[model samples]
Target: EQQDLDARVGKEIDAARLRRADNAFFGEARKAESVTPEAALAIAHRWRAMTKAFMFTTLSGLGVMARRFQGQDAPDHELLAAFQTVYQVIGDDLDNAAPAFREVAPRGPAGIHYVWWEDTVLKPVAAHVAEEDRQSAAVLPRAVTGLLDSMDRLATHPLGAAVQLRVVEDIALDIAVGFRRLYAKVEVPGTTLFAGRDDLAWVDSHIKAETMHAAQVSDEDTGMTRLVADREQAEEFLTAVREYAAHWSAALETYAQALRDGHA
Candidate 1:
């Protein structure tokens, strides 16, 4: 039963052409829609690293949320159950993702993007913005997007709904970005891309192939059965999600403008 659903999602995702041409919600940040290898490497590296960076926050927050809801006072809170399911599935797939990324990462220019991301963007933000605003700017988006959003009614109260967000963050984002990479690889194929990406054998075969979309989507239908049952929770969930998305978007726009200003 599950296998069949996964097969279907894979087919659709593939038919989507796995590129920046047209893809996931808010996929532009994670996309490979670059004109040069440098830009491709830059965006791709940042999105991947940023997601990785959030993993620490993700696990710790989700873990804490799990225990938060798990306390004896809650007495089998469904929200707690929702939190744990998401917290667990994320680990299961992303565990496979981390090593794969570290293994395939360019190890040269790409790695520098990770550093540049911190020094120029993430690290510097702290000294400038008030901590409270910073939380609203950075922390809230990942927590909310990663924790709750459009997916609430997609599956179970939050489990099926929640998993898709991370999957989108993790794998779906990669697919969207991947099209640009492949387009760059085949067309430009030089420093026009990453410093030493052409040399990586993984480029020919795997690369952005690592994704958890199918696994999570396979459960989407069953999860949504209960999720759609509650209308009030559904509306509240979306409000939080969209609000967080804007929070995240504003932060990126600031960074992008800053980077452009610094470069110019």
Candidate 2:
């Protein structure tokens, strides 16, 4: 049953990740012909805002894992390494990119403020994650599951940061998958960037670095061991994750259309 749930969680996460390929805003623009300089810039500006507001600090999943295991008296080094290895790059987002992004607030008084992204996109995303967290805390407890401290804040309390983290990553990933096609079409000279977001392309290029395998780790530092769940329990976890992911696309759709109408 534990194995079944774990395997199902992996598959469902993959499905959620792949769903972005169908996104018309970026997906349809996959063609070299479809991606004009102006169009690509539009994509860049839109994505950059989302990145600054939340994507720049995406680690809720890692944070959740961290909080989930904080009670462990002795953590398995192998699993800890696995967790850090996958998130190292994501963590890099805040380091190399956040300062550059934060500069946006100072530079713009007229166009695409950070608040716009928060209001239009991130708020809806924020609310969704809160609800999901509530659901997860209710069902996945220590008794039925082997994971310790179901009441632990990481395991129990609703996470605004959790959703904020997801909001940033999900929207950015949509472009990360296909930005290269646009990159090749972009003819900017004397710069290591595509509309100043070549970094995203780099992250996307390195997907295999993490996606090649899934990482699993558990901590029982408090004496209670990690709980294993059935496919049914993992279902809620997967749904919480996917449900927010789906809303990300919808919000993007609305924002993109609003942006287009504004541009026209």
Candidate 3:
């Protein structure tokens, strides 16, 4: 089961990479007339690198979440292993892509855009992992909301409005894609364990609701946004993702307690 899950996750990672690559190429082609070939390549590299970096960080967090579920009697070992494999593959890919992308676009607007990924996307994703481990969902959503709000404010600064708009669009796209992929994984049977815990359910529900609100503030206007606009709609979405993570977390804690009590 673990191997099968790993294979499925591997395919998903590959699909994500291909999607990134296609988007990068499309961005390059769209701007080719306005920019030099070299500049277009540089932009593409920067975009792809940032995308890969976010994916790497997200997978890493997923990995930690997965590890927490291992060794339980009803452990979602398949889901855990799948997440672990995703981290391994994407993390290594980013290590190479990041340096090369940096080399091509050393500074200025490109660098600033990259920083947005670091601050907004990567940091929030990393925080999700930490929050899950600490059983602190409030912290993750709050942090993510704060970051997005900060970005919205920064968009009005003296920096070129075009650049700011581009950053906003990119960040929104990145977030939408991440959530969509996670939603896909959540629908898989074993991954729904987190939703089973009441306390965690409340936390997850709140986070999802808040996230949808934030997404609307940013004018996402599609996908999950349309589905999650109302409080009740948002809560349902949150319930799905929460059940997976919370149940898995509870199962792991129960197994650990049993071992400590010498019953396992």
Candidate 4:
């Protein structure tokens, strides 16, 4: 069953031509070399807006699914593995913790990445930019919004949705890497992104944690091939993954184009 689903996902990804979409996203991100500070803040604003509206919220859905499927009598091993990964994701996002500790916060949640990007990246950069450009009112593209809206529908079957969330996260490994590298390279005159700060807790934590996530998400034994009982549901799952990949590719391009044009 895992092999069949794995093959189907791979075939669907290929059929969707995600490699082309990846190229578009990375190609645009590469334009970071020429971005002005104002434009950099604009790009940062859009991403902050994105995380506020989508990223952490979607991840929280994984926790919801995990709780829904928790404590089953002799739960499927794959489901157990999936929920384990979900806990790690939630932990890392909310508290910037290492995966070695499976336990998460009893209350409160994200996510460290969102907070870091906002406080560390966007806030400082906004200081250098004009007040007009500081308004981080960037709207999510309709395609991205519509796709995220689909998550509510997808969650109807908790296990399947949790597995799908895991798979979709797998697709974003490179995107995350690209974003980190791009931000690190951004050159703003007065505000250094960071040389070293007293409160540097989240700095190394997210990177180390994501590396662990990458391995689990890529391993065949624990990766995207996790079981979904019905063939039709699996197809829908794959379709959502492909659509999000495509939409986000365009979304990145939209932000990058704004950066390159220096239209803050």
Q: Could you list the CA RMSD of all candidates, in the order they appear?
A: 10.2, 12.9, 23.9, 4.4
> How should the candidates be ordered by TM-score, best one leading?
4, 2, 1, 3
Query: Model 1, 1-264: lDDT tens per residue?
Result: 334333433444344333234333224334323333233233333443444544444454454444544565754444444454455445533433345445544454434323433443244223434455444444332433443333333333232334244334434444333433433432242223333544333333233443443343234442211222255644544443344344334433432332233210
Cα-based TM-score, every candidate: 0.43, 0.46, 0.25, 0.74
Superior candidate under lDDT, 2 versus 4:
4
lDDT of 2 by residue, 1-264 (tens): 544444554354455443555555555445335323333444444444444434322344456667756878876765455455435435434332233333332234322333433443233223323444333322321222221122122223233233333233334445545555554554333543334543332434334322321121211221011222234544555555455455445534533342343220
Q: Rate the local accuracy (lDDT) of all candidates.
A: 0.38, 0.39, 0.31, 0.56
Candidate 2: regions farther than 4 A off = 10-17, 32-38, 52-57, 60-64, 75-82, 86-89, 92-174, 183-235, 251-264
What TM-score does candidate 3 reach? 0.25
* lDDT against true structure, model 4: 0.56
Residue 164's C-alpha lDDT in candidate 4? 43
What would the per-residue lDDT of candidate 3 be over residues 67-115, giving only the tens digit for each residue? 4446455744443343333333333223322332333322443343345
Model 3, global lDDT = 0.31
lDDT of 4 by residue, 1-264 (tens): 667766666565555444435455566666566556666677676666555544455565565665656656566887667567656654555564655322321223434556666776677667676776665324455654554555444444454444444544554455565566565666777567655542233434444455567566556676644635477767766666666555555556666566567754
Query: Relative to the unseen true structure, what is the C-alpha lDDT of residue 219 in candidate 3, on a scale of 0 to 100?
Result: 38
Residue pairs that clash (backbone atoms under 3 angstroms), model 2: 71-222, 72-220, 72-221, 73-221, 145-227, 146-226, 146-227, 146-228, 147-226, 147-227
lDDT: the better of candidates 3 and 4: 4
Q: After superposition, which runs of candidate 1 have C-alpha atoms over 4 Å from their true positions?
A: 1-34, 72-85, 92-94, 97-211, 214-218, 221-232, 247-264
Error of 2 at 161 (Å): 9.4
